[PDB]
Each structure stands twice: as C-alpha cells, then as structure tokens.
Amino acid sequence: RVXEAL
Amino acid sequence: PQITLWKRPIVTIKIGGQLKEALLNTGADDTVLEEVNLPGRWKPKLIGGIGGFVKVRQYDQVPIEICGHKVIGTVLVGPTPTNVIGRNLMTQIGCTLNF
Amino acid sequence: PQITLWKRPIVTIKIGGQLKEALLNTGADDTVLEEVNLPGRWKPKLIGGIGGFVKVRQYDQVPIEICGHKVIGTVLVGPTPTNVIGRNLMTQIGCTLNF
Numbered sequence A: 001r002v003x004e005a006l
Numbered sequence B, C: 001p002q003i004t005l006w007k008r009p010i011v012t013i014k015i016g017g018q019l020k021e022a023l024l025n026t027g028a029d030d031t032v033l034e035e036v037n038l039p040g041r042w043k044p045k046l047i048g049g050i051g052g053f054v055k056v057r058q059y060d061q062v063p064i065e066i067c068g069h070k071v072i073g074t075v076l077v078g079p080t081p082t083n084v085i086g087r088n089l090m091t092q093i094g095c096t097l098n099f
Helices: none
Strands: B010-015 B018-024 B031-033 B043-049 B052-066 B069-077 B096-098 C010-015 C018-024 C043-049 C052-066 C069-077 C096-098
Parallel strands (some): B031 B069
Antiparallel strands (some): B010 B018, B052 B069, C010 C018, C010 C052, C043 C052, C052 C069
C-alpha cells in the first residue's frame, strides 16, 4: 500500500 | 463525473482549511498528503510503496472535501512526491473503475 | 464491467504466455511487472514511487491480455511489491473513474 512515475 | 485516464486523474481537495491537488489513486489503500497541517493527536506509521518505505503521521476522522463531496477518513501526512487519495476515501465518494 | 474500490482492484493478465495477477493502478503512469520473462531487446529505465526509485527494463510493443481484452504496450519489468497496470494500458482497454 501505495503504488509510480518515471 | 467521469474521468478518463489519458492524463493523471488529479482532483482539488480542501482539508484543514487549505486547498490542495491530489491524485486519485486506485493502487493506494491509504490517502497520503505532503504539506498539510492537521490539528490534534496523531500516530506514527510507515507506509510502503514502489521504491521503499516512508514514515508518516496518521490522523483519524479528518474532514475532507473531494471535488465538492464532503467525506471523513484517515489521512496520512508525510514524504510523497504527489498527494494521493487512496481507496479509503474513494469508496466514500462512490468512485469506481469502468470498462 | 465495473469494479468498486472496497478491495484492491486486482485483475488477471496473460503476458508472454504467462498468467499473472495485477493491480489496476490509476496512480501509475506505467505498467510494472516482476518475474515475467519477456523476449527481445529492452532499454534500462528507472522509476520513482513513494519512498524511492527502482531500476527496470523497458520492453516496447508487448502484447498483453488484461481481463480478456487484447492490448499492446510498454511493460516495465523490475522489483515491484505488486504487479501494476498503469494508465498506458488502462486507456487501451477504455478504463475510466466514475463518481
């Protein structure tokens, strides 16, 4: 629990 | 409303009398905000994510407006590159995935 | 189909001849999987999340079947605590947020 960017 | 996913699903919230933007995040569990200051007592907690873990403050029963819907839940305050609304609040405003 | 957010929105994918479970993640720009074995050339990339950055391989034009819909896109393969389907694929299957 909690997931994203480049 | 209906939100497509061609761009980040960002909404405006109001919390502790301050306005913020936040990402609607179906991969969260919990709501985490960066620079708010909530009144009262909190509990220390660690949350996990993709690159590691972060230490946060858990506040309970925090009133929050999310696109004009008024909701009360737990919000975690700590280090995050973006504010995130997680499933805990999204279930309160009725939010679903559709395809 | 319509999926509420009272539990994690997990779906079944087929990719590279393998079946996996994966989290529908509107808080993810990109799709990240662990322990999938994809063919061909890739490029190295780094992704950030809460709590840090991770080193991944980028594969382009990877065919993927997500809840019995066939799509094609970029798949990042690297250390993730849970498989994640991001917006780059969710748009392909027509997925939206509704409240």
